[PDB]
Design a protein around this nucleic acid. Structure first.
Ligand SMILES: [Ca+2]
Length: 75
DNA sequence: GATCTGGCCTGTCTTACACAGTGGTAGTACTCCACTGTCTGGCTGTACAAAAACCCTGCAG
């Protein structure tokens, strides 16, 4: 199998070269994609002409540091 | 005697139409920017009384 081959043959090379792996996890996008699941439910327009547009808007809004910083609010 | 076919019902599906919502927009109406004076009422240094509910005490029973 593939990943097995990667991990028994190719781990050391990349770990040597590009600093760190798992650092570049795809985990983030897929894992977070459940946000695209929920946003469609709650804040839809709704009409697919807009459904994207407003979903993307809310998403990026939820994504910037700035509002996350203001969400922490002194721990 | 034993079976065909319209007349009529209803149980099942289906199809228009209604609400349901949501971010965007327009139309509307209710809150102040700032100027200037100016009146009203609640704070501050002790003194005099007025009410008030319990407590003692006399004296009445
Ligand atoms: Ca995946």
């Amino acid at each position: 199998t593939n990943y097995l081959h990667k991990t028994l043959a190719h781990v050391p090379e990349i770990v040597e070269r590009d600093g760190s792996i798992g650092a570049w996890a795809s985990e983030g996008n897929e894992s977070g994609n459940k946000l695209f699941r929920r946003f469609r439910k709650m804040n839809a327009r709704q009409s697919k002409t807009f459904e994207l547009e407003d979903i993307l808007k809310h998403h990026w809004l939820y994504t910037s540091k700035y509002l996350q910083k203001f969400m922490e609010a002194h721990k």
